[PDB]
Amino acid sequence: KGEELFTGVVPILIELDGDVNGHKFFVRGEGEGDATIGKLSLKFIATTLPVPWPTLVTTLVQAFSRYPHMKRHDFFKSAMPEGYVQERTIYFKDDGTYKTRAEVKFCGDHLVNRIELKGIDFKEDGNILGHKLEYNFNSHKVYITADKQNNGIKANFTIRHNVEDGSVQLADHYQQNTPIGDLPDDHYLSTQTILSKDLNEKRDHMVLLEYVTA
Amino acid sequence: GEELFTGVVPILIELDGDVNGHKFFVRGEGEGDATIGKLSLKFIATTGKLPVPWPTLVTTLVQAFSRYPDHMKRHDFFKSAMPEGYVQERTIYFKDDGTYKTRAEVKFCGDHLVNRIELKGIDFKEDGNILGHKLEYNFNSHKVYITADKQNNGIKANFTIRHNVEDGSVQLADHYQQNTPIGDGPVDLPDDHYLSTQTILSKDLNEKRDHMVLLEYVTAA
Ligand code: NI
């Protein structure tokens, strides 16, 4: 109950109302998802960035990860279509932190993820505000655990952003997800993500390809 | 239900349509402000290219965003139906051409207001104004006449859209509308009033896909 909504391809819409150190911004994303194979394809675009796109990549539909014998362990699919609240605190080392609250749910043929991001204490002209991050993304494993207290899931992981000079900028993620309406065992999502661009696009944008499997 | 439009709320529209067999899908997204009567939307055909001119889909693609003056607040059938929502049904007769049949469910889905629509266009003449794409990319000013429908605890609407044609004439589209609430509606059925509609159609320069961007102001009277 909830698996049938991901029988094949589903249209996605992402919305992010964000500000970092005061500089408000807005990003919209559209595209499609196929939970059956674990593929995502999206075209993000800043309609208002004071911040590099890759720091926004984790926070921008985990429901689409390919779960193999683990179908009921899928908190993300089973909370559908009521949805879940995903809350995160992202601390970037020796630099600022983002706070995000997002509501992921279904709305017609569409699956939607509403985000409000607020970023604070960022060093001016550090790796993030000085834009020293490479326009790319690496592969990571996120560890999902069960949370009996609020009938949901906790997650812990660290993102390794590659920096233009050759060093690395770490981003500690702390995550909590709880359902909107009406527990899975310790498992992992391994993520692979490509960031690119479209040739004839003068607007600020991100082209995103993801493969995530449980 | 008024409290749901205290300020700006995000909108999503879903349109599944086929005209004379030609299937399409339009998704729209944007923002609405009932306090000023403003709508700002960017629609997009995800099925590729529309077999139909954009202006003919404009009345079909959220009247809950129309600005009622304070003294008519209880007369706003659309807002009082929230968040349960209402069903909107229309029959559109185009003079010298086909007819649209539409059914939509307008309701809330989280912080969002969503308009889910399924349209069927039929008996449209090959080489007419519509399938022949002779319609100007713009939109005129109209008044929709709303009456109370005691029969189904809802409202009827009557109006005609005046479509400008590329060569210099106008193409008429008689609209027939009936709205019924999903839950408890308004505490009273509204008296005869009209919405004055004003609409701008434009394009985004950077967008190579088939799209339209819409700006609307609707106020009651
Ligand atoms: Ni359909």
Best of B26, B109, B116, B211 to mutate (most A CBs within 10 Å, chain A): B109
Token reading at B174:
């008689």
Exp. method: X-ray
The closest alpha carbon to A112, from B27, B122, B199, belongs to B27
The closest alpha carbon to A132, from A81, A160, A91, A168, belongs to A168
Determine the 3-state secondary structure of B79 from DSSP: helix
The C-alpha of B155 sits at a distance from chain A's nearest C-alpha, in angstroms, of: 25
Asked if A15 reaches chain B (Cβ–Cβ under 8 Å), the answer is: yes
- Cβ pair A107:B112 closer than 8 A: yes
CATH superfamily, domain A1-214, is Green fluorescent protein (2.40.155.10)
Q: What is the chain B residue with the closest CA to A81?
A: B109
Measured between alpha carbons, how far is B158 from B26 in angstroms, rounded to an integer?
25
- Cβ pair A107:B111 closer than 8 A: no
Residues of A in contact with B116 (CB under 8 A): 108
Asked if B112 reaches chain A (Cβ–Cβ under 8 Å), the answer is: yes
Task: Indicate the domain borders of chain B.
Answer: 1-221
Token reading at A199:
């040739």
The CATH fold of domain B1-221: Green Fluorescent Protein (2.40.155)
Asked if A130 reaches chain B (Cβ–Cβ under 8 Å), the answer is: no
CB A211 within 8 A of CB B215: no
CB B154 within 8 A of CB B63: no
Query: Is residue B201 packed enough to be buried (19+ CB in 10 Å), middle (13-18) or exposed (0-12)?
Result: middle
Counting Cα atoms < 13 Å in the Cβ hemisphere of A51 gives 28
B97 CA → ligand 1 middle, Å? 25
Q: What is the resolution of this structure in A?
A: 2.8
